Design a protein around this ligand. Structure first.
Ligand SMILES: Nc1ncnc2c1ncn2[C@@H]1O[C@H](COP(=O)(O)OP(=O)(O)OC[C@H]2O[C@H](O)[C@H](O)[C@@H]2O)[C@@H](O)[C@H]1O
Ligand SMILES: [Zn+2]
Length: 286
């Protein structure tokens, strides 16, 4: 299924990660798509199983969505089909345990690259969604934000004879459809202004808002350590925060099955399934 192959977890790494967490009172956590593979959502870059390893799916480019009605129709028809399954995924034990650490006052702040809403479903409050969330829709004309669930209803009224089955769900809820399968589909406009609606996610080629990025960096200034969970950090948007931790001289730990771009920066690396390991990390001696 969606989790990449990994050797049995090594208990000495687990013990090293524990010693790391025990020394932190204000943990800054970064997560990527690897935290959600145990929920049934594929990641992008896992050897063998990741969308880009195993398939020839290609990300939509920001520029193309913005400049082409036909691209927007393609994008939304696929998103439509994928939405009932994508929106139904549930948080796993890794999401839950990170929420426990927050409750315990040990997690200072968590940034995610994921768009799946799973940390929100788990109850994580001290959260930044770096790349947005597919559960939100924004208008490119007026910047009004609405719920993607409400858009589903609008798609059904506009496209009453639409059916296709959902095939190859991606980490952003996209499913494959052919250009002829999607050719007819009609996209609802903004109810306030009539402008073009976009999911409130940072597509390839877009950039994260600078004020938002700055505000996350501000949260980092109070942390005393960084943990990265389930990201290859091959995408600069995420890797810059590990670079920032190193500039702040924070110790860095990584819980990730494959290699990451920040491996060179880590004090501790646990190559294991995150859901196997996080439940064992304790916040109180026991
Ligand atoms: N259960 C697991 N436990 C631990 N590690 C895991 C697990 N499942 C997978 N991994 C590891 O999880 C890691 C997943 O890495 P990648 O697939 O690059 O996802 P990203 O979140 O970093 O992608 C960043 C952006 O790229 C996109 O364009 C979007 O914009 C994304 O937001 C691998 O190293 C796996 O070994
Ligand atoms: Zn509008």
């Amino acid at each position: 299924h969606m989790v990449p192959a990994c050797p049995p977890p090594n208990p000495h790494q687990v013990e090293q990660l524990q010693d790391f967490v025990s020394q932190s009172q204000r943990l800054f956590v970064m997560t990527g798509a690897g935290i959600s593979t145990e929920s049934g959502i594929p990641d992008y870059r896992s050897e063998g199983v990741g969308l880009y390893s195993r398939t020839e799916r290609r990300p939509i480019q920001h520029s193309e969505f913005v400049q082409s009605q036909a691209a927007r129709r393609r994008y939304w028809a696929r998103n439509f089909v994928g939405w009932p399954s994508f929106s139904s995924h549930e948080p796993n034990s890794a999401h839950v345990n990170l929420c426990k650490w927050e409750r315990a006052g040990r997690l200072h702040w968590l940034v995610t690259q994921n768009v799946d809403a799973l940390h929100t479903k788990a109850g994580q409050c001290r959260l930044s969604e770096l790349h947005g969330c597919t559960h939100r829709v924004i208008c490119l004309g007026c910047q009004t934000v609405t719920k993607r669930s409400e858009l589903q209803e609008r798609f059904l009224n506009l496209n009453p004879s639409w059916n296709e089955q959902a095939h190859g769900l991606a980490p952003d809820g996209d499913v494959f459809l052919t250009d002829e399968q999607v050719s007819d589909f009609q996209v609802p406009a903004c109810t306030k202004c009539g402008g073009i609606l976009k999911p409130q996610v940072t597509f390839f080629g877009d950039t994260v808002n600078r004020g938002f990025v700055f505000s996350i960096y501000e949260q980092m200034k109070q942390a005393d350590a960084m943990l990265i969970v389930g990201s290859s950090l091959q995408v600069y948007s995420g890797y810059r925060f590990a670079l920032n931790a190193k500039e702040l001289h924070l110790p860095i730990a990584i819980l990730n099955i494959g290699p990451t771009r920040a491996d060179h920066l880590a004090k501790v690396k646990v190559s294991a399934r995150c859901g196997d390991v996080l439940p064992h990390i304790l916040l109180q001696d026991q």
